[PDB]
Design a protein around this ligand. Structure first.
Ligand SMILES: *[C@@H](N)[C@@H]1CCCN1C(=O)[C@@H]1CC[C@H](COc2cc(C(=O)O)ccc2Cl)N1
Lengths: 726, 726
């Protein structure tokens, strides 16, 4: 009775999840769009009004992939001709539509192939990067001022990150920050002059006679890194005749002594900006708080407002030092730092006092700070029910740290255990986003007394569709290893029979600070495996895992490829003895870091796994970028950690692959985990006489996400799994 | 009962074939290298003495991979530090040993990384190429004379071929020709300045952090080709105070009108040299016969003494115009050319006569002229028994073309139907090499009466072993496709039972002028498949096939990817109806051209084949090198043959692969059939939603021949075939 969730339903996305993506434009209203017009809503009452009819651009001539309405409500940024680059970066074409006089601007238009564009936070000023240089437009129809003149392809980047900074530190292409009211425009400048280049072939369309060689500045472990500089320009002092002047903010001397990184920039006030720098050895970081000197024009950072954050058990921050959240006057601030007990909690700082006061504590962690009002601090943590894989919104009274109130825990405990929030301009209202374990539920609330205003989207449509299908269940529980408990999850086939022995696929990632066992609702490949192929899909979080304190997360410091792989094996070893797992049919697969662990596990010789699939795996740490690798492994030098670098490679384990069935998959145009990584694995397996399956995806990058390659890789992997299991 | 020829026997070469490679050093003696030392043999009696002891170079400090004794017998050339490049090219270090004073010459030594070395034809002069420049050594311990100063890596090649000339015209790295008595040294100069570069990654040892990019001047179909120049320097008049003066030999005028090639150079006398040129449209070739001008110091090629060789049905020559064989006075010569009936036979020329005279004829072809005396012309042909797949040595009396005698036909009819030959300096003696159908048999003979002096090697050892194993048999026969005979061969399993139904594997190459159906004895993968797996391994020579006249060979002229793949499909269709074939289990596989045909067949939609393996296949002709591709396809322009270039790609047939099981294999460092070709095949299959198997071999080239890769690919393919047929 009832059909199952098939591979085709997954590949064709036949069971869609409804979202409610809104954009706050004030403290009272937000914008909501369908696949047509953009409506404007009143949070208090719920009523709306068309902000601009979908028709407006019927004969534009181009497909619009995104809009961006200025804080003024006066103009609209039209983005089209989207050309994806790396994970976050991309170039596109832009046009501005004057909302007032309903007309398209055609004078002094934004150049084509613009790398990045952003409105000011309050009016309608524009800042865009083109050809690695920064430009500013005070008025959409007036000419723009060139702010920088050093841009140079693959060499100098102004206002935009280079490859490694986009991927490993800012998780963005953008490298510029407007001040609160738009008076100042801060930006970073990267110099990749001496950064080695990764080179790989790109075949392109069949018509291309000779393959093209792609080369990008990419620092691998221990290689030369790009240098960085920081500047702040005043957008009200620029004219047509004179060239704008950018004031640089240098140092700290404690940083200039060696290699370092700019890891965070956050404006505190109209005239105060805070910067956080990190040494190449990501053990020590410094925060400068700089103020504008009206009667001098430059920016000074008082060594007194400078705060040091370092670590003795590992690196600093989850991936980088957390960002600060300042009080309105900018004289104090809050930020998430590790406990003396190893747990990340919110600490309160006076900008000119070295010691901070923790306002939260306990054996759980604060995920992030979401808003700050004069009376409350709102944050998300996994405190509730002591489960690390849960997320809930809380508020804490700034006058009594003892008064903590959970705003989402009780709304619907059975259906919602994972929340994210979106506050209005002055935190007068907020939207709660529950994404599991049940179907996603979006609601609106008012901060005065946290009264729930209404439901924005309950995904009832999808719910009706799903009762017609045999959906799998999800079990989130834990096991204890050496006193310490570690969580895991199991996507169980429909009508799970604890009597029967099902085959088990271990879906793994296990990279530092990862979490694969949570309460999130997901419709993916694992859903298909359990629902149609009756396969149990598990995930486990062992040493190195995040959101559980540094004792667990820093357990693999300077030692990647050890405990996180071992625990992965110990997990399935315990899983097999649970009674309903066929210990003769246990597999393992993973992508990127998960490909590394999958490979390391298959070549461990544990004898626990029959087969496994590795997609875009790392094979030896010297092949991966510096910022990420060195953060956990240090430098690959004899004086530092070279021995472990050479001891944690997949090829050193080639001989052990004789006992398993392996599938190695990799995209030839992977700019992240280079094909090189899989090429060396395959070569080691060949030199030892180990047979295995392989598949390359020409011109696909790290996500192997083209519509056809995506369908093909999961189809290929499905056949392999079924074959290993039947 | 009994064991079979297993995959392991093939990969580990358990049953070794014995050879007998001798090197004629005169008209009466030859050198025969034992695994340890080199022996000198007297052909008359068969008596031998040690030319040089195996221990002579114990404390040499280097592993010697080859020798080379000057025609003088005075010096030995020791080759070491051998580093392979393309199919024929390589570099190495050399040392000269004085046989008389038994002492290693340590002064004015030949440079390391030498690209080519060769003694003169009569004494002990030396010519070598280093850094693309030529050098001459009149005496082994004297300073070299630099002949050329224009050499430059990847641009100008003096005395050595560039990538395409090496692979497609001369089948050698060498581009220099000593005159008969060593007085003159002729050489070619290649200019690759504007030739595009193929670029691909080479991963190297695990320790290489960044993959290196290899780039080599490689002209793909229709691209800019290298230019060539020919020079001749007198090695008897070189000073040491003045730079060597090289005299250039240009034209023909009929070749200078556009792109052309130097396709052959053969000396006629001490002062007459012959040169053959080919137009880029390999339809027309011209032979120049140039004479040295004693009292002018130059070379004159009298347009009147030149002979034109062209074709209206196709291209000239099997792969290129054949080489001429001049008579004593250099006034006349014999050379194989296509009949008026389209069969290649020997034609007798006069250096200044317009029409030649055929000395042989019939519906069969002369494979090659092996030796020419003032008395007889010795040649190899497939006339005997009217079997194009057979080879025998014949001699035709120059005084009476009626007196042609077969010298090998009757030696051993049952065991020997395929001969190659090696004559002594003046053709006084000759070694016959029988390579099938029976075990290879090496014999020695004297030309005077054609007496069989003695057996050199009869593989009696391998025969004692094979008698204890269930070896397969070979069936060589033909089928008749509308008025014409087309041969094929079948490797049949032991105890072949015409009533049972065996699965059949079609081994295919099918490129122009190829021949896969012959009487040659082989111990290969097919041997294993038939013997152990009981699989019939067939091969078929259809339209385009060679050694059967132009009507058959030129049938695919300007039409690659048509008739040769169709006929491949017909053969399989006809084999499945012979009564001993399981039409449910028919497969096909091929390498390089064979991979292209295999792919085209599997994408034809005929449904005849269940599965197929394509190794290093061509996927579209615009990706392959010009000299080869254009010879059969013409130019890829609208005015020439662009349309068919586009009609014959593998990717355009991707949709038809849904009905087959395909295994695509390619070495990532293939400098001949670039990985690119397979990369486009896989991309087309993915974009069409077709599942298939793939395997890349990192850092392997076109041969995928390293010890480990060779054993791995064949083990991988066996599994694929077993699975497909079981
Ligand atoms: C694969 N066979 C590709 C397909 C197009 C032609 N091709 C080549 O590799 C061409 C064919 C002519 C030239 C030399 O080919 C060979 C040379 C030798 C040798 O021992 O010198 C052996 C086998 C071949 Cl195919 N490259």
């Amino acid at each position: 009775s009832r059909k199952t969730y098939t591979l085709t339903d997954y590949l064709k996305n036949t069971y869609r999840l409804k979202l409610y993506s809104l954009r706050w434009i004030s403290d009272h209203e937000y914008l909501y769009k369908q696949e047509n017009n953009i409506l404007v809503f009143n949070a208090e009452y719920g009523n709306s009004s068309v902000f601009l009819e979908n028709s407006t651009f019927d004969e534009f001539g181009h497909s619009i992939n995104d809009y961006s309405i200025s804080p003024d409500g006066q103009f609209i940024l039209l983005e089209y001709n989207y050309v994806k680059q790396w994970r976050h970066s991309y170039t596109a074409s832009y046009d501005i539509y004057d909302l007032n006089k309903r007309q398209l601007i055609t004078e002094e238009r934004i150049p084509n192939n613009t790398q990045w564009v952003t409105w000011s936070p309050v009016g309608h000023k524009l800042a865009y990067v083109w050809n690695n240089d920064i430009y500013v437009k005070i008025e959409p129809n007036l000419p723009s001022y060139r702010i920088t003149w050093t841009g140079k392809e693959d060499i100098i980047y102004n206002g935009i990150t280079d490859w490694v900074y986009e991927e490993e530190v800012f998780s963005a292409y953008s490298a510029l920050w407007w001040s609160p009211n738009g008076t100042f425009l801060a930006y970073a400048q990267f110099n990749d002059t001496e950064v080695p280049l990764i080179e790989y072939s790109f075949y392109s369309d069949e018509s291309l006679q000779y393959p093209k060689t792609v080369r990008v500045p990419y620092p691998k472990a221990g290689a030369v890194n790009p240098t960085v500089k920081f500047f702040v320009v005043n957008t009200d002092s620029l004219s047509s005749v004179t060239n704008a002047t950018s004031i640089q903010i240098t140092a700290p001397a404690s940083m200039l002594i060696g290699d370092h990184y700019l890891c965070d920039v956050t404006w505190a006030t109209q005239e105060r900006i805070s910067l956080q720098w990190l040494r190449r050895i990501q053990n020590y970081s410094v925060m400068d708080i700089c103020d504008y000197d009206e009667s001098s024009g430059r920016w000074n950072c008082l060594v007194a407002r400078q705060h040091i954050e370092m670590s003795t058990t590992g690196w600093v921050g989850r991936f980088r030092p957390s960002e600060p959240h300042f009080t309105l006057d900018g004289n104090s601030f809050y930020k998430i730092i590790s406990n003396e007990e190893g747990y990340r909690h919110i600490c309160y700082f006076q900008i000119d006092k070295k010691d901070c006061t923790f306002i939260t504590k306990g054996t759980w962690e604060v995920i992030g700070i979401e808003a700050l009002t004069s009376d409350y601090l709102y944050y998300i943590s996994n405190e509730y029910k002591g489960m690390p894989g849960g997320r809930n919104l809380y508020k804490i009274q700034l006058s009594d740290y003892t008064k903590v109130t959970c705003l989402s825990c009780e709304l619907n405990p059975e259906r919602c255990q994972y929340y994210s929030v979106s506050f209005s301009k002055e935190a007068k209202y907020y939207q709660l986003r529950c994404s599991g374990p049940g179907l996603p539920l979006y609601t609106l609330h008012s901060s005065v007394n946290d009264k729930g205003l209404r439901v924005l989207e309950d995904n009832s449509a999808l719910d009706k569709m799903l009762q017609n299908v045999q959906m799998p269940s999800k079990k989130l529980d834990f096991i204890i290893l050496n006193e310490t408990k570690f969580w895991y999850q199991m996507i169980l086939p429909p009508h799970f029979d604890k009597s029967k022995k099902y085959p088990l696929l271990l879906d793994v990632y296990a990279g530092p600070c990862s979490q694969k066992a949570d309460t999130v609702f997901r419709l993916n490949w694992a859903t298909y495996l359990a629902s149609t192929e009756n396969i149990i899909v598990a995930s486990f979080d062992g040493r190195g895992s995040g959101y559980q304190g540094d004792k667990i997360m820093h357990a693999i410091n300077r030692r990647l490829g050890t405990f996180e792989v071992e625990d992965q094996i110990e997990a399935a070893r315990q899983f097999s003895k649970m009674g309903f797992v066929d210990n003769k049919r246990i597999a393992i697969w993973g992508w990127s870091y998960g490909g590394y662990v999958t490979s390391m596990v298959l070549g461990s010789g544990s004898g626990v796994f029959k087969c496994g699939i590795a997609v875009a795996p790392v094979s030896r740490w010297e092949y991966y970028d510096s910022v990420y690798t060195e953060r956990y492994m240090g430098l690959p030098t004899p004086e530092d950690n070279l021995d472990h670098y050479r001891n944690s490679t997949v090829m050193s384990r080639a001989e052990n692959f004789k006992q398993v069935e392996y599938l190695l998959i990799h995209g030839t145009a992977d700019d992240n985990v280079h094909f090189q990584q899989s090429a060396q694995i395959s070569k080691a397996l060949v030199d030892v006489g180990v047979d295995f399956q392989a598949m390359w995806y020409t011109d696909e990058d790290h996500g192997i996400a083209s519509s056809t390659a995506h369908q093909h890789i999961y189809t290929h992997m499905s056949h392999f799994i079924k074959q290993c299991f039947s």
